[PDB]
Design a protein around this nucleic acid. Structure first.
Length: 70
DNA sequence: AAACATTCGTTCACGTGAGTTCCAGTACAAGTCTGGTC
């Protein structure tokens, strides 16, 4: 972002779907359950920028969580 | 001759080692879900 501001736009990197136990996935779902929004290809959100791979449901970055990927 | 102390074989309680059953931790293998491209 411009100096002294929070990030506004995001660029997709990759899907990850392994490395979490069932309980961790349940807790993550409960945390982010309220903030999921349906994804419409015709009116994509401004904050998230995607290529050919698009999600079924998108969550605004302000309410999401950081994940470590190996 | 009578009273008191000592000794002996017995008795009970409590502690420790070996055998047996049951359950938790560990290991390994297979199944299931996922990711990426061409």
């Amino acid at each position: 972002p411009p100096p002294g501001e929070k990030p506004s736009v995001f660029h997709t990197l990759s899907r990850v779907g392994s490395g979490c136990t069932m309980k961790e996935l349940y807790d993550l779902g409960l945390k982010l359950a309220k903030y999921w929004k349906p994804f419409h290809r015709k009116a994509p959100p401004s904050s998230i920028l995607c290529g050919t791979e698009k999600p079924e449901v998108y969550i605004e970055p302000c309410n999401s969580v950081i994940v470590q990927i190996k």
